[PDB]
Enzyme design. Structure first.
Site, PDB file in Angstrom:
ATOM      1  N   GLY A   1       2.627 -34.423   2.959  1.00 26.43           N
ATOM      2  CA  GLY A   1       2.634 -32.905   2.681  1.00 26.43           C
ATOM      3  C   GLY A   1       1.709 -32.725   1.754  1.00 26.43           C
ATOM      4  O   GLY A   1       1.048 -31.497   1.575  1.00 26.43           O
TER       5      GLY A   1
ATOM      6  N   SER B   1      -1.111 -34.252   0.928  1.00 24.88           N
ATOM      7  CA  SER B   1      -2.680 -34.848   1.232  1.00 24.88           C
ATOM      8  C   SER B   1      -3.267 -33.386   1.417  1.00 24.88           C
ATOM      9  O   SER B   1      -3.320 -32.388   1.918  1.00 24.88           O
ATOM     10  CB  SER B   1      -2.829 -35.590   2.490  1.00 24.88           C
ATOM     11  N   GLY B   2      -4.916 -33.771   1.066  1.00 21.82           N
ATOM     12  CA  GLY B   2      -5.911 -32.930   1.174  1.00 21.82           C
ATOM     13  C   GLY B   2      -5.981 -31.910  -0.307  1.00 21.82           C
ATOM     14  O   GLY B   2      -7.071 -31.517  -0.379  1.00 21.82           O
TER      15      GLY B   2
ATOM     16  N   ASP C   1     -12.382 -40.144   3.695  1.00 19.36           N
ATOM     17  CA  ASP C   1     -11.288 -38.979   3.905  1.00 19.36           C
ATOM     18  C   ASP C   1     -11.351 -37.940   3.523  1.00 19.36           C
ATOM     19  O   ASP C   1     -10.989 -37.371   2.211  1.00 19.36           O
ATOM     20  CB  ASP C   1      -9.911 -39.763   3.652  1.00 19.36           C
TER      21      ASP C   1
ATOM     22  N   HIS D   1      -7.991 -36.523   7.269  1.00 19.49           N
ATOM     23  CA  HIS D   1      -6.760 -36.856   8.287  1.00 19.49           C
ATOM     24  C   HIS D   1      -5.840 -35.952   8.508  1.00 19.49           C
ATOM     25  O   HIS D   1      -5.056 -35.990   9.492  1.00 19.49           O
ATOM     26  CB  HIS D   1      -5.984 -38.008   7.448  1.00 19.49           C
TER      27      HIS D   1
HETATM   28  C1  LIG Z   1       1.827 -40.732  13.756  1.00 22.10           C
HETATM   29  C2  LIG Z   1       0.951 -41.437  12.874  1.00 22.10           C
HETATM   30  C3  LIG Z   1      -0.528 -40.908  13.205  1.00 22.10           C
HETATM   31  C4  LIG Z   1       1.149 -41.115  11.111  1.00 22.10           C
HETATM   32  C5  LIG Z   1       0.537 -39.717  10.864  1.00 22.10           C
HETATM   33  O1  LIG Z   1       0.687 -38.636  11.429  1.00 22.10           O
HETATM   34  N1  LIG Z   1      -0.136 -39.787   9.608  1.00 22.10           N
HETATM   35  C6  LIG Z   1      -0.005 -39.144   8.342  1.00 22.10           C
HETATM   36  C7  LIG Z   1       0.634 -37.973   8.496  1.00 22.10           C
HETATM   37  C8  LIG Z   1       1.206 -37.375   7.330  1.00 22.10           C
HETATM   38  C9  LIG Z   1       1.946 -35.934   7.021  1.00 22.10           C
HETATM   39  C10 LIG Z   1       2.912 -35.524   7.804  1.00 22.10           C
HETATM   40  C11 LIG Z   1       3.407 -34.155   7.797  1.00 22.10           C
HETATM   41  C12 LIG Z   1       2.569 -33.420   7.370  1.00 22.10           C
HETATM   42  C13 LIG Z   1       3.093 -32.019   7.347  1.00 22.10           C
HETATM   43  N2  LIG Z   1       2.570 -31.087   6.779  1.00 22.10           N
HETATM   44  O2  LIG Z   1       4.206 -31.911   7.684  1.00 22.10           O
HETATM   45  C14 LIG Z   1       2.016 -33.858   6.281  1.00 22.10           C
HETATM   46  C15 LIG Z   1       1.094 -35.098   6.101  1.00 22.10           C
HETATM   47  C16 LIG Z   1       0.130 -35.229   5.157  1.00 22.10           C
HETATM   48  O3  LIG Z   1      -1.069 -35.203   5.681  1.00 22.10           O
HETATM   49  O4  LIG Z   1       0.492 -35.707   4.110  1.00 22.10           O
HETATM   50  C17 LIG Z   1       0.938 -38.064   6.061  1.00 22.10           C
HETATM   51  C18 LIG Z   1       0.375 -39.463   5.913  1.00 22.10           C
HETATM   52  C19 LIG Z   1      -0.001 -40.188   4.811  1.00 22.10           C
HETATM   53  C20 LIG Z   1       1.485 -40.954   4.625  1.00 22.10           C
HETATM   54  C21 LIG Z   1       1.510 -41.739   3.020  1.00 22.10           C
HETATM   55  C22 LIG Z   1       0.637 -43.065   3.606  1.00 22.10           C
HETATM   56  C23 LIG Z   1       2.798 -42.278   2.996  1.00 22.10           C
HETATM   57  C24 LIG Z   1       3.305 -43.316   3.486  1.00 22.10           C
HETATM   58  C25 LIG Z   1       4.541 -43.546   3.480  1.00 22.10           C
HETATM   59  C26 LIG Z   1       5.786 -42.615   3.047  1.00 22.10           C
HETATM   60  C27 LIG Z   1       5.182 -41.328   2.876  1.00 22.10           C
HETATM   61  C28 LIG Z   1       3.722 -41.156   2.858  1.00 22.10           C
HETATM   62  C29 LIG Z   1       0.651 -41.146   2.346  1.00 22.10           C
HETATM   63  C30 LIG Z   1       1.055 -41.436   0.743  1.00 22.10           C
HETATM   64  C31 LIG Z   1       0.641 -40.753  -0.285  1.00 22.10           C
HETATM   65  C32 LIG Z   1       0.665 -41.461  -1.790  1.00 22.10           C
HETATM   66  N3  LIG Z   1       1.855 -42.224  -1.819  1.00 22.10           N
HETATM   67  N4  LIG Z   1      -0.209 -41.377  -2.712  1.00 22.10           N
HETATM   68  C33 LIG Z   1      -0.432 -39.687  -0.112  1.00 22.10           C
HETATM   69  C34 LIG Z   1      -0.598 -39.458   1.281  1.00 22.10           C
HETATM   70  C35 LIG Z   1      -0.042 -39.990   2.253  1.00 22.10           C
HETATM   71  N5  LIG Z   1      -0.216 -39.348   3.645  1.00 22.10           N
HETATM   72  C36 LIG Z   1      -0.324 -39.890   7.141  1.00 22.10           C
END
Ligand SMILES: CC(C)CC(=O)Nc1cc(-c2ccc(C(N)=O)cc2C(=O)O)cc([C@@H]2C[C@](C)(c3ccccc3)c3cc(C(=N)N)ccc3N2)c1
Length: 238
Positions: A186, A188-189, A93, A44
């Site tokens: 942030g 993720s990965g 993923d 993602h």
């Molecule tokens: C515009 C749309 C297409 C949205 C889009 O872009 N999606 C998207 C983008 C980002 C993202 C954005 C910026 C940056 C950067 N570096 O600035 C990096 C990332 C990044 O990858 O983490 C993240 C996600 C999810 C969010 C989620 C579910 C969540 C749900 C609700 C709130 C917080 C988090 C979550 C929860 C948990 C956990 N609680 N375990 C683990 C992973 C994740 N990842 C999806």
């Protein structure tokens, strides 16, 4: 990372920070060194990543503020995304980054072992999630790499917590019933690293969840053991 603490330098030497170069130096996602030219991360993270040329992989970093113009990094030769990937919540993923040059292993940068297919039966009791992600839902990327110890949750229990989703055996969950510690945006990965018999194993890849660190909402991770064969297919191709 929610409810975590600052890491010490060299503590998670397989943790990398994947940066994008445009318009400025910015963290994109976490990742793990798994081989001398291989990073394992989340699919993602790559939406909008058109070319591997915009990527920089930094290893041996504790603080984002260390990243100087003369800080060494690895260029990415190829981005390999699982062909069944559609969205984090549906699984698959996972992605590999093939590096342009070889990582020279040191105390600050070295690989994490993949789980053994023969270890799909082991019960890990010492698991940590690490990253530069948010400390709360509305936050920003952190300077210092954070760490949090989180317990693994059975697939059956995790499915009870996400009744409206399909939690597969290709996913692994981790979290406290009361909440309080979790990965967040942030992170993720990056790795979900577990220590078994003195050896760290890459059990999960930070993927998704319903918010961050909420009560009875464990974090959902890619279950790496279920992808060992896919990883070998891509890394050991003739
Ligand atoms: C515009 C749309 C297409 C949205 C889009 O872009 N999606 C998207 C983008 C980002 C993202 C954005 C910026 C940056 C950067 N570096 O600035 C990096 C990332 C990044 O990858 O983490 C993240 C996600 C999810 C969010 C989620 C579910 C969540 C749900 C609700 C709130 C917080 C988090 C979550 C929860 C948990 C956990 N609680 N375990 C683990 C992973 C994740 N990842 C999806």
């Amino acid at each position: 990372i929610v409810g975590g603490t600052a890491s010490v330098r060299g503590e998670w030497p397989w943790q990398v920070t994947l940066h994008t170069t445009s318009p400025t130096q910015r963290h994109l996602c976490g990742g793990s060194i798994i081989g001398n030219q291989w990073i394992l991360t989340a699919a993602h993270c790559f939406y909008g990543v058109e070319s591997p040329k915009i990527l920089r992989v930094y290893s041996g970093i504790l603080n984002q503020s260390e990243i100087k113009e003369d800080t060494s990094f690895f260029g990415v030769q190829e981005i390999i995304i699982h062909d069944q990937y559609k969205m984090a919540e549906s699984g698959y993923d996972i992605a590999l980054l093939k590096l342009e040059t070889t990582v020279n292993y040191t105390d600050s940068q070295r690989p994490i072992c993949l789980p053994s297919k023969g270890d799909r039966n082991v019960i890990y009791t010492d698991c940590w999630v690490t990253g530069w992600g948010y400390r709360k839902l509305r936050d920003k990327i952190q300077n210092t790499l954070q760490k949090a110890k989180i317990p693994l949750v059975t697939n059956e229990e995790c499915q009870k917590r996400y009744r409206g989703h399909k939690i597969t055996h290709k996913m692994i969950c981790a979290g406290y019933r009361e909440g309080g510690k979790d990965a967040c945006k942030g992170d993720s990965g990056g790795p979900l690293s577990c220590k078994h018999n003195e050896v760290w194993h890459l059990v999960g890849i930070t993927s998704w969840g319903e918010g961050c660190a909420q009560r009875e909402r464990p974090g959902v991770y890619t279950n790496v053991v279920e992808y060992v064969d896919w990883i070998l297919e891509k890394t050991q191709a003739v």
